[PDB]
Design a protein around this ligand. Structure first.
Ligand SMILES: CCCCCC/C=C/CCCCCCCCCC(=O)O[C@H](COC(=O)CCCCCCCCCCCCCCC)COP(=O)(O)OC[C@@H](O)CO
Ligand SMILES: Nc1ncnc2c1ncn2[C@@H]1O[C@H](COP(=O)(O)OP(=O)(O)NP(=O)(O)O)[C@@H](O)[C@H]1O
Ligand SMILES: Nc1ncnc2c1ncn2[C@@H]1O[C@H](COP(=O)(O)OP(=O)(O)NP(=O)(O)O)[C@@H](O)[C@H]1O
Ligand SMILES: OC[C@H]1O[C@H](O[C@H]2[C@H](O)[C@@H](O)[C@@H](O)O[C@@H]2CO)[C@H](O)[C@@H](O)[C@@H]1O
Ligand SMILES: OC[C@H]1O[C@H](O[C@H]2[C@H](O)[C@@H](O)[C@@H](O)O[C@@H]2CO)[C@H](O)[C@@H](O)[C@@H]1O
Ligand SMILES: [Mg+2]
Ligand SMILES: [Mg+2]
Lengths: 370, 370, 282, 481, 370
């Protein structure tokens, strides 16, 4: 009903993938773990489920230790990454398999399946087998199984990962509507940052088995705690510029751009633990860059790519003195041909700053929604 | 453990087992005890194996020569005929079934090989071995052949070998001297060389067995064969016009076939020794019983005096006895069944061309003695 | 389904002839038997294709006596049909027994963790490499002492011959384990979370998905026991209790070569294994 | 519930295993039983429940007859030395000599009770017993009479029905001695040949010669104040059979030579059966082929025919001078190969027959194993422009040999000890010249050791064969390390 | 090089999976086939490649017919959906395999491999086997393989489809930059509409075999041919409102809204072949919708879902009398809680209209970008 992890550490022989990680998940909270493939998303979910052993640490589910408790008695229900649909059994039997064994209730089985099959639209596919269904239908069956189970905790391991793009958008709504309806604890796992940002009440970002940041989606977006978090959230990747600190002040930090026109801007950012001459990274999102006529800190270069998305326009610009393309993003429609010269404004208020060790300097600018 | 209350009988497949069974049905009719006749493959080998563990048949049939090996191994019970019964058979047959002053089996019938010839192809069969190659050329051009007989067993090839002066064991006045073996001498060599010379001149094949010989004669492909009384029943069916005559002479000297006496012993492990006695003495060894077997496949010249005189009028049996007189009786000493194994290896390896007659026999000579 | 080059038929036609000639080369021996089984007489030599049909050899294989014009009614020399049913019993029961023992054991080897699971399987295979033929002395003595206590599985019994084969499972255990380690782990894990005990997962999840491998293991074991000779003919003593393998070697007595009678029984002996193949289309 | 009922047999069998001797088998029967109870009872050992019934079969029917077969090697187990001592004397005590003369007996009913009558032929006199009831060992004193017994003589059937009770009746004459039933019509004096006193010394009753158990050779032998009684018994000899393998020149001679043939025979079997098996498995599943399903059943058919009957029909087909293969192999070409006489031609035949025997199993295997290759690997190959041959050697073969290796090293193990093929087809093929033991050219290690023990003539030493059987297996124990 | 399809039809016995569809693909053109799973995308690609036969119609590559030409001789390469990497072969052997067989050149192999491994950073993976590589690397080997082959036409069956969202976005840029660097004809297959827009010179939309529309990405966005194209292209799905035609003019068409407050508005759209009283569908994109204080056409409902994306805010509104939550889209951050009331503006200039069958009425509103 309320899972929480204290000093949790997973190890394989000698390799310590995850160090002591602390997580507290409230009742009815929708928590999404995000990170790249092979960062330990499934493992965390498996350790909560009891399919994987916790090497060192304490695991509580509803104010009681669960480490050694067998998976079946954990009050937990998992939607597997593969769907784990029994190939020999029908859709009806796939969803009812839990309450089929260990105390059969013929009358109840019929009811519990049909109630769940109604709210997923699986009524005409009950007597069908997993091979006859499509990937989109198979997903709903896998979720159905746990919906029939009605556990206190849900564990969804990339439930949208294998679906079509258009079907992946549709199902996101079906998930959020199901969450507020059931009002129960949900631990969600995905590589897609979009799913984290839309569905979650609280996001946990994972980097090489390490928790990089925990907080609300909008907190993660506006105030990342390190370079990794900043570069993991947001439609296109945040822009990063190698800067050198030239001066410091309690209220803001001044850095030097790597350009031949060595411009120096004051950034409203925590001066805490930053030294002059220290090489750092300037963070700025494609959406936050302004048209040249607005600002005074200008960045000019040659257009490499023009991506006409229809609803917006994404523009990749080669700025001399930095061999990473500056990505620009503008609403509606912008008529710029590839190879043309393009200038944009770099707004100091909307900038992130990261130390050598990638740790973020706390932004002192107040963004709405946090 | 041999079962009590019934009689299991073992007899070689080339004898009249179906007829012997008819005798068993009469024994069953009078006593109420079932007689099972069986004809297992390689009987001479199977019996010693099963009997040693107290298993196998109650009554065992073979020629007397193997019975000495069986008696020494403790596989045979001493049979106990009274004075009145012994006087019903010929005394020389009781001598064949005598081992160390004790009677070990009931002798049934005297066996001896004779030259069997096709009258339509060959009205005047050869008196000599020497004139067969000349005759073969005559018949070979006619689409046929002179002589085809089993070469795989020494029993069929010994007459030619023992013609010029071959012998198994030199019989001194009293007992068989087991250190004087005549398979190495000039006489034995000359005979077996003649056989090889018939093969080397394409008159015979080195690998001609009993099955091929019986086929060739009964289908009218060969003019001559060398076989025993048991084989006449098959020739009758083939309706081939055949005669039975003296074996051809080699180097002036007559062929000397080892004379066998079909004998019935009682297993030393039978709980039916009394019933086994009654069957053999009062059922098999009567005019009726022997007729039943002889009518299936001819026994030859039987040991029972009463039926022998009925049977002596048949010229086939006269010729069987004529060749029997010219050959000598097979010894029953335990070294005899070890005599055959070496001669088998010797003849086959000489006929194939793997060894010269001189080398092939010398190996056998040093094997019998040891 | 994919466009094909160089006229295609150049290789396709020449393949049809090569297999067509190959099936002829391998069917020949079997066609000989069928021909010998219809040829009159029991001789070892005869015409390649029979001049006239006989039926006689098929009559005594099925249990009927025949009347040759010469010497009255000749009876069936051997109970071939009984031998046939005997072979099916011993191999059928044998193969179910082998499947049950080897399938359960492999399930523990593939899934369950217990110390020294590698060395035991290694040892199982090496020990099984030793031929049963060089153990006949000890095997007879084994079923001799075992027979006087549990009579239905001793010497001269089919149960004894079945229990004798029940040892050779090491090979199968490996194969079945290998098949299990191919099935998706999630299915048994999803079963565990549903509450299923290790046995419940074995029967309701893993077994029904392993039908084809267990089918192969059965067919292989069934074939193996149909053709076993050394042990079978060592333990089985009574003619009426012989399996095909034991009994069928009584036809070819050098001095009583019933080559024709044998042929009819030989074609009949192909029936059980073929019956299995034809039912194993699922 | 079931723990107690299965616990009942632990004590109903276990205790009786200790009784009636049988010390050799009483040990392992408890060790295997007590391990089964400990595993299946408490739920601390659950993984072993799936393993135990498997390994119990392995132990009883594979591991035991092997350990036992190694024990056979330390003794002189032979065609002569075959039984235990207590079975040897049991045989020797059972045999009996006829002392007294024979009498013709008759069975005559007198109400519910029976009456026996004998008749001496020498004197002509007749003797008749008092009324008696059949059952148990009883002695009847016969009395001379001139009269006929009341009630008709019993027919053979009736005397046969009462045969057991009649065999225990030991009648005795007024003048002669004891006389027992000898047949359904006769009574004769049959006394046991030997008597066994306090010590294990058998003494003869006809000749009077005493015999004592000689445990060096394993026989009862005559002692003077040399005859050898020859049922014989099994007695330990130690390393004597093992040393003979390292001492003899005529046993070692073919021993190394057939080893070469054994390995060469099985290597060539595996190679050709895999080749033929795989190539056909590829062809039967080939899309472009027409009657795939018809080809599939036809190529499998050889496997639907038991091995032993195939070999037997091949044996007749491969005959040298006659036999249908050479009949047509001389019509065309003109040669009749020496399939049995020649060592190589025989060895060739074995392989031809074994390939025929062994290809369907490899085909079936490759058919299933072939499905592990995804179709799109051949589609990517088609883009690059690979022919059928190129596909086979660069993709198919190397992708099949890995999952195939364990099954073909298993095939090597099978065909290493393919006893039934050799025994039935050739039984050693051509004979190996000048050997102390029976040996052939086509004999395998299993065949050679079998010839040493079981083949009649040329020695039947089960012990020597057991020593070589152990010596092979322990040296195959190098395949482990 | 120039690939063109005339009346190409694929059938499976009776199932006409693809209607007679014409496509003209010019030299060096980046063409993307888009559609839902099972709409026949791979079937088309395989028909072009030669992996699937053409049941009816004609296919030309470089102006010669290819229908009956084997796949290899088509001058065409393919990156497979599953990568189709040879499991037993190394990366260097996987990449060179093509020209390795027939016309093998040791020195030329090394060049083409190392050059393609350079541009994909695969020089350190050449000695490795596909099982050791990550999914993202294996994709680069799959593309790398065909780049070594240097075909005139590139066929890509969902190359990005199996990657992390952040790795998928990054790989889009690589493909674009690879396209312009080579300048050769590329046929791309995906289900993601985002990939179609950002990569294609020309888009081909497939609806259950049938080609729905062909043209420039920016043309497909503004002017869809039917309801399917409109609903398939665009970040979130376009809002569809059932409307009733009440008035018709020569310039525009007036329709009635399904609200209790029956409002009516003119839409500058095609009026050729239209009827009064016909149940039509109103098309309006989430981005095009306006704030309530600006426009005159107002839609008001209850907020159900609020998705805070950071860069934009998407709001799902429950409008009464229509069981479809209307989707709004706006920049930066919008402070509106879930459950609160909200109103938006409907602009007639940015409206689409569809017939009963689904055929779109030609938009007369001039858009920038066409
Ligand atoms: C000693 C050998 C004895 C053989 C006995 C078998 C008797 C049957 C007679 C047939 C003889 C073969 C004649 C070749 C005819 C060409 C057949 C053909 O052209 O058909 C090919 C069938 O493949 C295929 O068996 C490929 C063709 C196989 C040819 C290779 C044969 C060489 C075998 C020697 C190699 C030894 C193996 C080593 C084992 C350790 C077509 O393949 P593709 O469509 O490209 O592949 C893709 C598909 O398979 C995808 O599923
Ligand atoms: N049984 C195992 N043995 C060793 N390593 C493992 C095992 N299972 C998982 N891992 C490692 O755990 C890491 C993360 O796995 P996973 O939890 O699946 O991450 P993901 O982001 O969900 N994909 C991988 O890099 C694996 O190498
Ligand atoms: N080999 C085949 N046999 C029969 N039908 C097929 C075959 N391949 C594909 N189809 C059908 O064609 C449709 C589209 O196939 P495909 O083009 O692979 O889908 P996609 O849109 O690429 N994902 C599927 O719905 C199948 O039913
Ligand atoms: O050939 C060796 C063999 O010879 C004799 O066997 C004869 C047998 O006596 C005949 O009755 C008939 O069955 O043919 C046999 C030969 O095939 C000896 O009797 C026998 O001991 C010996 O092994
Ligand atoms: O290879 C020759 C051999 O093949 C078959 O033997 C199989 C056996 O049937 C299987 O059970 C398994 O153990 O593999 C063996 C060979 O690898 C035939 O059964 C047999 O006739 C033939 O000799
Ligand atoms: Mg995962
Ligand atoms: Mg596809």
């Amino acid at each position: 009903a309320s899972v929480q992890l204290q000093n949790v550490t997973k190890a394989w022989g000698e390799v310590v993938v995850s160090k002591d990680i602390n997580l507290d998940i409230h009742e009815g909270e929708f928590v999404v773990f995000v990170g790249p493939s092979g960062c330990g998303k499934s493992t965390l979910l498996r350790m909560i489920a009891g399919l994987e052993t916790i090497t060192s640490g304490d695991l509580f589910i509803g104010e009681k230790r669960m480490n050694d408790t067998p998976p079946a008695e954990r009050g937990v229900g998992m939607v597997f990454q593969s769907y784990a649909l029994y190939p020999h059994l029908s859709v009806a039997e796939n969803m009812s398999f839990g309450l089929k064994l260990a105390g059969a209730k013929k009358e109840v089985i019929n009811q519990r399946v049909n109630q769940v099959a109604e709210v997923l639209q699986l009524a005409h596919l009950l007597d069908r087998k997993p091979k006859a269904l499509s990937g989109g239908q198979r997903q709903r069956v896998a979720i159905g199984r746990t919906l029939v189970a009605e556990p206190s905790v849900f564990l969804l391991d990339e439930p949208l990962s294998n679906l079509d793009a258009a079907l992946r958008v549709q199902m996101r709504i079906e998930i959020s509507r199901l969450h507020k309806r059931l009002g129960r604890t949900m631990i969600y796992v995905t590589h897609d940052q979009v799913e984290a940002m839309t569905l979650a009440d609280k996001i946990v970002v994972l980097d090489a088995g390490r928790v990089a940041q925990v907080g609300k989606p909008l907190e993660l977006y506006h105030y990342p705690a390190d370079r990794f978090v900043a570069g993991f959230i947001g439609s296109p990747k945040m822009n990063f510029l190698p800067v050198k600190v030239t001066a410091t002040a309690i209220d803001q930090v001044q850095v030097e751009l790597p350009m031949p026109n060595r411009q120096q801007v004051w950034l409203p950012v925590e001066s805490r633990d930053v030294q002059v001459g220290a090489n750092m990274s300037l963070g700025i999102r494609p959406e936050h860059l302004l048209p040249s006529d607005i600002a005074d800190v200008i960045l000019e270069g040659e257009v490499q790519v023009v991506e006409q998305l229809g609803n917006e326009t994404q523009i990749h610009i080669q700025i001399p003195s930095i061999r990473q393309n500056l990505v620009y993003r503008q609403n509606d429609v912008v008529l710029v041909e590839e190879g043309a010269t393009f200038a944009i404004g770099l707004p100091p208020e909307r900038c992130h700053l990261f130390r050598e060790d990638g740790t973020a300097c706390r932004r002192l600018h107040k963004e709405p929604g946090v | 453990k041999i079962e009590e209350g019934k009689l299991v009988i073992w007899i070689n497949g080339d004898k009249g087992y179906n007829g012997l069974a008819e005798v068993g049905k009469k024994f069953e009719k009078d006593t109420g005890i079932k007689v099972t006749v069986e004809h297992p493959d390689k009987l001479e080998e199977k019996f010693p194996q099963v009997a040693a563990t107290g298993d196998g048949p109650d009554i065992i049939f073979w020629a007397h020569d193997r019975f000495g090996c069986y008696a020494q191994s403790g596989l045979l019970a001493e049979i106990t005929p009274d004075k009145a019964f012994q006087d019903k058979l010929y005394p020389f047959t009781w001598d064949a079934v005598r081992y160390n002053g004790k009677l070990i089996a009931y002798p049934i019938a005297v066996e001896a090989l004779s030259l069997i010839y096709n009258k339509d192809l060959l009205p005047n069969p050869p008196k000599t071995w020497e004139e067969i190659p000349a005759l073969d050329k005559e018949l070979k051009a006619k689409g046929k052949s002179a002589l085809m007989f089993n070469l795989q067993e020494p029993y069929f090839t010994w007459p030619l070998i023992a013609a010029d002066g071959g012998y198994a064991f030199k019989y001194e006045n009293g007992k068989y001297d087991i250190k004087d073996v005549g398979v190495d001498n000039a006489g034995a060599k000359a005979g077996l060389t003649f056989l090889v010379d018939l093969i080397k001149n394409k008159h015979m094949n080195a690998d001609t067995d009993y099955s091929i010989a019986e086929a060739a004669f009964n289908k009218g492909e060969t003019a001559m064969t060398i076989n025993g009384p048991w084989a006449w029943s098959n020739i009758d069916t083939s309706k081939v016009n055949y005669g039975v005559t003296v074996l051809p002479t080699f180097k002036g000297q007559p062929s000397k076939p080892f004379v066998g006496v079909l004998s019935a012993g009682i297993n030393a492990a039978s709980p039916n020794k009394e019933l086994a006695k009654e069957f053999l003495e009062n059922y098999l060894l009567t005019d009726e019983g022997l007729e039943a077997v002889n009518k299936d496949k001819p026994l030859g010249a039987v040991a029972l005096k009463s039926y022998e005189e009925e049977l002596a009028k048949d010229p086939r049996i006269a010729a069987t006895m004529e060749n029997a007189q010219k050959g000598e009786i097979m010894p029953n000493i335990p070294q005899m069944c070890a005599f055959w194994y070496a001669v088998r290896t010797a003849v086959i390896n000489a006929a194939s061309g793997r060894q010269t007659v001189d080398e092939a026999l010398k190996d056998a000579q040093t094997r019998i003695t040891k | 389904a994919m466009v094909q080059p160089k006229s295609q038929k150049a290789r396709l036609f020449i393949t049809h002839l090569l297999l067509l000639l190959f099936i002829a080369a391998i069917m020949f021996p079997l066609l000989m038997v069928v021909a010998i089984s219809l040829r009159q007489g029991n001789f070892a030599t005869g015409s390649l294709i029979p001049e006239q049909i006989s039926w006689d050899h098929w009559k005594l294989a099925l249990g009927f006596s025949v009347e040759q014009a010469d010497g009255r009614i000749t009876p069936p020399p051997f109970p071939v049909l009984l031998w046939l049913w005997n072979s099916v019993k011993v191999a059928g029961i044998s193969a179910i027994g082998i499947v049950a023992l080897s399938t359960t054991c492999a399930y523990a080897f593939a899934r369950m963790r217990f110390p020294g699971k590698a060395t035991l399987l290694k040892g199982m295979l090496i020990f099984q490499m030793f031929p049963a033929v060089l153990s006949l002395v000890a095997l007879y003595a084994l079923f001799d002492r075992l027979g006087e206590y549990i009579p239905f599985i001793g010497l001269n019994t089919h149960g004894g011959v079945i229990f004798a084969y029940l040892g050779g499972i090491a090979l199968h255990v490996w194969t079945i384990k290998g098949y299990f380690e191919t099935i998706d782990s999630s299915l048994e894990e999803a079963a565990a979370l549903d509450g299923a005990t290790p046995w419940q997962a074995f029967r309701l999840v893993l077994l029904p998905l392993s039908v084809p491998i267990l089918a192969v293991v059965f067919i292989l074991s069934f074939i193996a026991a149909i053709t076993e000779v050394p042990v079978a003919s060592l333990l089985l003593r009574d003619v009426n209790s012989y399996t095909l393998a034991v009994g069928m070697q009584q036809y070819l007595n050098p001095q009583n070569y019933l080559w024709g009678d044998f042929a009819a029984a030989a074609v009949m002996s192909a029936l059980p294994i073929t019956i299995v193949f034809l039912l194993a289309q699922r | 519930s079931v723990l107690g009922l299965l616990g009942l047999l632990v004590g109903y069998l276990v205790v009786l295993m200790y009784a009636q001797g049988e010390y050799l088998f009483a040990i392992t029967t408890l060790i295997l039983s007590s391990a089964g109870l400990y595993i299946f009872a408490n739920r601390k050992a659950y993984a072993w429940r799936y393993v135990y019934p498997g390994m119990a079969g392995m132990g009883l029917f594979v591991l035991f007859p092997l350990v036992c077969t190694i024990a056979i090697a330390f003794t002189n187990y032979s065609s002569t030395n075959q039984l235990t001592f207590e079975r040897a004397q049991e045989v020797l005590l059972d045999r009996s000599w006829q002392a007294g003369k024979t009498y013709n007996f008759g069975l005559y009913p007198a109400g519910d009770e029976w009456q026996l009558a004998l008749s001496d032929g020498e004197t002509g006199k007749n003797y008749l017993s008092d009324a008696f009831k059949f059952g148990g060992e009883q002695k009847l004193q016969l009395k001379e009479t001139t009269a006929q017994p009341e009630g008709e003589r019993a027919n053979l059937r009736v005397i046969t029905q009462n045969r057991q009770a009649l065999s225990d009746i030991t009648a005795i004459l007024p003048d002669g001695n004891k006389v027992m039933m000898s047949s359904l019509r006769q009574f004769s004096g049959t006394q046991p040949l030997y008597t066994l006193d306090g010590d294990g010394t058998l003494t003869n009753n006809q000749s009077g010669v005493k015999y004592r158990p000689n445990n060096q050779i394993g026989f009862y032998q005559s002692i003077t104040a040399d005859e050898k009684l020859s049922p014989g018994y099994t007695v330990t000899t130690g390393w004597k059979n093992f040393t003979r393998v390292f001492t003899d020149e005529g046993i070692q001679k073919p021993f190394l030579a057939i080893f070469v043939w054994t390995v060469v025979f099985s290597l060539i079997t595996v190679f050709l059966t895999v080749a033929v098996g795989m190539v056909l498995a590829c062809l039967v599943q080939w899309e472009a082929l027409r009657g795939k399903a018809v080809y599939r059943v036809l190529l499998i058919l050889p496997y639907a025919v038991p091995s032993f009957i195939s070999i037997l029909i091949f044996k007749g087909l491969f005959n040298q001078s006659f036999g249908e293969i050479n009949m047509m192999l001389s019509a065309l070409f003109g040669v009749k190969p020496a399939w049995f006489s020649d060592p190589t031609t025989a060895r060739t035949m074995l392989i031809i027959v074994n390939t025929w025997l062994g290809y369907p199993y490899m085909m079936i295997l490759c058919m299933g194993l072939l499905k592990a290759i995804p179709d799109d690997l051949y589609e990517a190959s088609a883009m690059d422009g690979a022919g059928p041959f190129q596909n086979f050697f660069k993709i198919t073969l190397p992708l099949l040999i890995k999952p195939l290796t364990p099954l073909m090293i298993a095939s090597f193990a099978f065909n290493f000890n393919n006893f039934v093929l050799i025994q039935l087809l050739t039984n050693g093929g051509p004979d190996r010249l000048g050997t102390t033991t029976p040996a052939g050219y086509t004999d395998l290690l299993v065949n050679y050791t079998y010839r040493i023990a079981f083949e009649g003539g040329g020695g039947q030493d089960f012990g020597l064969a057991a020593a070589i059987a152990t010596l092979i297996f322990l040296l195959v124990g190098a395949l482990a390390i």
